[PDB]
Amino acid sequence: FLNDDIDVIERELEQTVRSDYPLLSEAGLHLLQAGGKRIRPVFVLLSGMFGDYDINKIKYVAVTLEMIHMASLVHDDVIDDAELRRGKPTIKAKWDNRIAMYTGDYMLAGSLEMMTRINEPKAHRILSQTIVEVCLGEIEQIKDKYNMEQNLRTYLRRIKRKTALLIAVSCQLGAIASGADEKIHKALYWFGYYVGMSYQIIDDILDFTSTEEELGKPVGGDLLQGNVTLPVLYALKNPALKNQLKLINSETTQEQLEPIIEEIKKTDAIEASMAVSEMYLQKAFQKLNTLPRGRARSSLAAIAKYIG
Amino acid sequence: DPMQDIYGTLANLNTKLKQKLSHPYLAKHISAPKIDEDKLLLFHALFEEADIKNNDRENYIVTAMLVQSALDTHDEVTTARVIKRDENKNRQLTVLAGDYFSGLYYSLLSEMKDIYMIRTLATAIKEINEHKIRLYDRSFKDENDFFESVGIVESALFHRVAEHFNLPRWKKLSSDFFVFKRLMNDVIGSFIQLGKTKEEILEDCFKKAKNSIESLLPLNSPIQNILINRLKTISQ
């Protein structure tokens, strides 16, 4: 029942990305086609149905978030030295790092342009602080590569900044753009945060438990690159595992890494990570149970159920 | 001593800007942003006469300088295929520092609840980036086009911020001065056009910047004295 509004969002998106400059125009089309299904607008629209839902206002929140994410991919590819992303070539490959920087910056400034159609200063306060928090998390990620002496709260802050916050504010900003009451949009902020935290924990579990075929990339790529995730945190309580995990660095090969992944899977780290993920999912269901029943609460409840 | 006072105002602005840009982990791996004190000077004079509260001036000046820092930081992201491992992480933190600085200025303006200034700056940042690409892709064609792009990249913040407050003078002054500064501090522009010599382009630019300083600012006002001596230093 959202397909018509999601189509509105995409037409706006497509029009906010044209350019009289052919290079920028063509780079814009390339970002339009990146990614699979647009996930963030759904959270925005469902949370907007808890106020005076109006596609002609709330669409600007969805376009802004889509554009922001687009800006991030272009810069992520330079940070990653990625020549291909999700099976397709990258902005920086087609052109170069400098062009990727400028196109990404052009996209991020364009999203701020878009968000200023929401003249609610509270929306800008929430979004601007989110962006600062995401950048801080990307910086702390570099600092903590291969840091096997980190504690759980380090990891929790990392995945809040990377994933949860953005679901959290997609929800809150949808409700705020539609005049929802304070009690309603703050409860939607907490639902999105709790749902995102549990999603990212699942994602990190799957990076060890799926086959190469399901992932479309080798198993354990978070750990190979130095990003400690939740199963590694529990596995690090096993001293013999920790003696190996401490030796992983940027020159470790896939073949050295995979016997370690098999050991992790023979501890109780996977199951311990599942439990934390489901504690978050339960806290997300609590917050939903404070909202009015209806089509929107049901759909968000569906989305959390598919995540567990 | 009005020279003393304006140098003390610039020194305070410089310190608040540096504290706002600093990050303990960035500090340990990449070089601090290189603050253009001419732009600092000109943003301070512009926000002197803008219709804003006195105790907002410093925040507006820092905001504008945060945008400049974001733009300048990303100019230092290299395009070298392979590199060293300590040099790759430096490149990664340089990409992140520029995006961080963008987040900070948007966050500063949100706290002041100035949504329209956000629109103005975002519009300026979009055109500055379009014309960086144009200049870098060597996509121009004329003496007119090339120079129109150099002036946009180098002065469009002053342009758009001045328009926002309906202030004259700042568009032409900053354009003349910073185009001159960028060209003085390029050697291949003559390989996609020409018109006069390298030394004729520069000294014509010096004359335009010299003239605007003397015309668009009060005689021996502290900002004129500073800028006129700065023109001489840049020429030398």
Q: Which two three-digit tokens encode residue A238? A: 């096993």
DSSP state letters, A122-160: HHHHHHHHHHHHHHHHHHHHHHTTT-TT--HHHHHHHHI
Contact B109, A109 (CB under 8 A): no
Assess if CATH 3.40.50.2300 describes domain A1-40+54-119. no
From B39's Cα to the closest Cα of chain A, the distance in A is: 21
Resolution of the model in angstroms:
2.5
* CATH code assigned at B187: 1.10.600.10
Residue in this structure with the two tokens 């629109």, named with its chain if needed: B119
Domain ranges in chain A are: 1-40+54-119, 120-308
DSSP state letters, A12-42: HHHHTT--SSHHHHHHHHHHHT-SSS--HHH
Residue A145 and residue A141: Cα distance in Å, rounded? Answer: 6
The four Cα atoms A20, A21, A26, A28 give a dihedral, to 10 degrees, of -80
Q: For residue B172, give the nearest of B154, B194, B189 by alpha carbon.
A: B154
Question: A98 and B77 in contact by Cβ < 8 A?
Answer: yes
Give the Cβ contact number of residue A173 at 10 Å.
34
Give the Cβ contact number of residue A21 at 10 Å.
17
The reply to whether domains A1-40+54-119 and A120-308 share a CATH topology is yes
What is the DSSP-derived secondary structure letter of residue B33?
-
> Terminus-to-terminus CA distance in chain B, angstroms?
28
Portion 5-44 of B in contact with A at CB < 8 A? 23, 25-26
Q: Say which CATH class A120-308 falls into.
A: mainly alpha
**Residues placed in the known binding site of A:** 37, 40, 69, 76, 80, 85-86, 162-163, 200
Number of domains, chain B: 1
Interface of A to B at Cβ within 8 Å reads: 19, 21, 23-24, 75, 78-79, 81, 96-99, 101-103, 105-106, 108-110, 112-113, 116, 119, 121, 124-125, 127-129, 131-132, 134-136, 138-140, 142-143, 250
Question: B126 and A116 in contact by Cβ < 8 A?
Answer: no
Strands (E), chain A: 84-85, 88-89
Contact A168, A287 (CB under 8 A): no
Question: A110 and B126 in contact by Cβ < 8 A?
Answer: yes
Contact A41, A62 (CB under 8 A): yes
Residue B81 and residue B123: Cα distance in Å, rounded? Answer: 32
Taking CB atoms within 8 Å and a gap of at least 24, the contacts of A238-241 are A238/A267, A241/A267
Contact A57, A185 (CB under 8 A): no
β-pair partners for A85: A88
Full residue range of the structural domain in which residue B115 is found: 2-235
From residue A203, alpha-carbon distances to A102, A112, A226, B82, B178 in Å are: 31, 30, 16, 30, 49
Contact A93, A70 (CB under 8 A): no
Give the Cβ contact number of residue A85 at 10 Å.
18
Give contacts of B77 with chain A, Cβ < 8 Å: 78, 97-98, 101
